Amino acid sequence: DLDLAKASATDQLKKAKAEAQVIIEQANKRRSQILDEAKAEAEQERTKIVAQ
Amino acid sequence: AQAEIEAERKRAREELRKQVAILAVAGAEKIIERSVDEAANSDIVDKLVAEL
């Protein structure tokens, strides 16, 4: 019971690490998309104003 | 994008200056040659031999 309790705690920490990394990477995924939206909006706006 | 058009502003002014100057002196050659006068030609010589 002492050994399996620490086994449960270590698999919980492994899950917690997994959770930690994924959350960071969805944030990282989000970061890339937003900056691409900003770059796309700026280039469209800029190109039509210079034509104007 | 706005600072770019105010750079472009200066490029457009300068190109028109160049045009009018060169067509102005092209007119001036025709205008002055047709308006040559022997008293005025002598007056050129009479000026430069006074400072020479």
Report the 3 state secondary structure along chain A.
Answer: CHHHHHHHHHHHHHHHHHHHHHHHHHHHHHHHHHHHHHHHHHHHHHHHHHHC
Residue of A nearest to B9 (CA): A50
Interface test with B, best of A39, A47, A49 (most B CBs within 10 A): A49
Residue A43 token pair: 């280039």
- Report the alpha-carbon distance of residue A24 to residue A41 in Å, rounded: 26
C-alpha triplet A29, A35, A41: angle, nearest 5°: 135
Residues 5-44 of A with CB under 8 A from B: none
* Residues in B touching A45 (Cβ below 8 Å): 1
